[PDB]
Ligand SMILES: CNC(=O)CCCn1c(-c2cncc3ccccc23)nc2cccc(C(=O)N[C@@H](C)c3ccc4ccccc4c3)c21
């Protein structure tokens with residue numbers, strides 16, 4: 046019993062975090078085999094960020110301009126290349142702690158763990174979601190660029206996020222590990238701002254199924270809804286449209302609790318209408334949307350990775 | 352910027368988790384040098400637990416009744432003994448991944464990271480507080496016994512909790528690593544229940560400071576108060592008394608923000624008396640009490656460990 050924002054054990058990623066220094070700039074890099082990945086804006090001064098030309102800035106750099114430090118060991122950079130918005134530094138030592146990994150680009154609504162690091166050293170680990178507006182609500186201070194986000198389903202690390210910058214409203218933007226930004230954001234000092242965010246409807250429903258699994262039924266009602274009537278209502282509360290894909294994905298949780306997905310939609314409709322009336326759901330006084338269906342199955346049943 | 356429930360990086364503890372089997376029971380052990388620590392109730396059948404004589408039950412067992420598996424590798428048990436409610440299994444092999452560590456007993460209101468494990472394999476990590484009623488609001492299923500809680504101080508792991516049981520309300524009870532229970536709980540099948548809880552006042556204040564640092568200011572006011580007056584309010588709303596030492600412990604945060612503790616207390620008094628009026632603080636509609644002052648400093652200062 047219980048329900049917690051539960052991250053993956055971070056050790057497989059800890060062994061990968063290094064410090065990258067270029068000029069006066071220092072941030073974090075990810076060391077996998079003989080390559081260190083980090084944000085390409087490591088090569089920029091604050092004064093370059095208004096209109097950087099990365100091709101021009103990078104061609105002026107040599108291998109020994111990059112100081113890579115693993116623990117208190119220095120790694121020799123022997124090559125460098127740019128792939129989209131990430132810099133790949135070839136070093137002549139392969140990381141002996143390189144886990145089983147792959148790079149995955151995720152969809153809005155997906156969750157992952159973040160290992161916040163400073164100077165190549167892990168600070169802490171927390172859960173995040175890719176918001177519908179393609180930002181993440183992280184906790185990041187100066188020096189955190191190059192921190193990564195990942196899942197570790199079944200003993201393989203799936204890297205899905207590298208941290209690049211904080212937007213004016215205090216949320217965060219970055220790339221996948223191929224260097225493509227999530228959303229329309231750019232590694233340039235512009236007027237870019239997060240779009241209006243929405244609530245991840247399929248996740249809220251999953252969390253309501255988690256509450257039922259753990260013994261709370263008080264928010265259910267005798268009603269049902271059509272998919273389209275549910276969406277017409279939910280979008281008036283700035284909830285994301287629920288698709289048939291989302292219904293299908295909730296199937297297993299529907300089967301385990303005996304509550305049809307559109308019946309759970311009926312309950313959410315009423316919860317949006319009424320609020321909680323002084324009650325909580327799984328310790329929260331708000332409707333929580335950063336647990337996916339897969340997350341709920343991962344936690345309300347017991348599955349682990351070595 | 353941003354504020355998240357942040358666990359410590361778990362890598363140093365992951366390398367210590369093993370699977371311990373005795374008879375039909377499987378749970379988790381903590382492998383440090385050549386000793387594996389786990390709950391002593393691992394030796395008991397369900398029948399035994401009705402009224403266990405652990406000393407007598409343990410003498411009926413021999414070393415090879417304990418099967419210890421570090422990943423794919425079996426460890427040979429060469430000795431066994433209890434300290435309080437913890438069983439100590441001496442093994443043939445010292446754990447080469449043993450971190451620098453201490454066994455520390457924590458106080459109510461202090462927080463720690465939990466590395467939830469099943470079959471000796473880490474599953475997830477989350478942050479918990481020791482409640483004033485000496486339970487923890489964990490997330491644990493069958494097989495999670497032997498999971499541990501810890502804090503990290505630079506390179507030193509401070510182990511402070513081992514998981515033993517879940518209580519009827521679904522909250523959790525355990526021991527320190529010397530096998531002393533937190534709270535008036537025993538490792539036997541008998542009627543046990545969590546006592547009425549209280550809210551950790553110094554932690555709410557710390558979180559209010561975290562909110563100010565992150566730009567949430569609407570609850571600040573012109574008023575200030577005294578310790579005695581505030582503790583009358585705290586007592587009425589089932590908050591822990593606030594002591595002079597709590598004020599001193601909040602000194603750094605009152606310095607980072609410039610808001611004296613008794614000024615912030617005036618804000619919390621008003622939040623308790625009149626509620627939040629549909630507003631939120633740091634993305635929460637209730638008053639969060641599982642962030643210590645040190646948690647706030649650590650997250651709004653970027654403290655790292657390695
Ligand atoms: C708000 N600012 C940004 O979020 C830009 C990046 C800021 N930062 C961070 C950082 C990362 N998370 C959150 C932060 C919150 C406050 C201050 C810094 C951070 N950790 C850093 C580590 C090394 C360098 C920088 C940095 O400042 N680099 C300079 C050249 C810079 C300036 C403007 C940029 C604009 C767009 C993209 C990248 C830009 C980059 C770092």
Ligand SMILES: CNC(=O)CCCn1c(-c2cncc3ccccc23)nc2cccc(C(=O)N[C@@H](C)c3ccc4ccccc4c3)c21
Nearest residue numbers: 377378396397400491492493494495496516517538539540
């Ligand atoms: C509600 N029950 C307890 O929380 C007792 C312990 C239950 N459990 C857990 C476990 C640990 N977190 C939460 C759980 C929630 C549901 C079911 C199991 C758990 N993971 C276990 C791994 C191995 C064995 C057991 C177990 O069941 N052992 C048996 C001999 C037992 C029986 C009665 C006990 C009474 C008091 C103390 C320990 C008792 C122990 C385990």
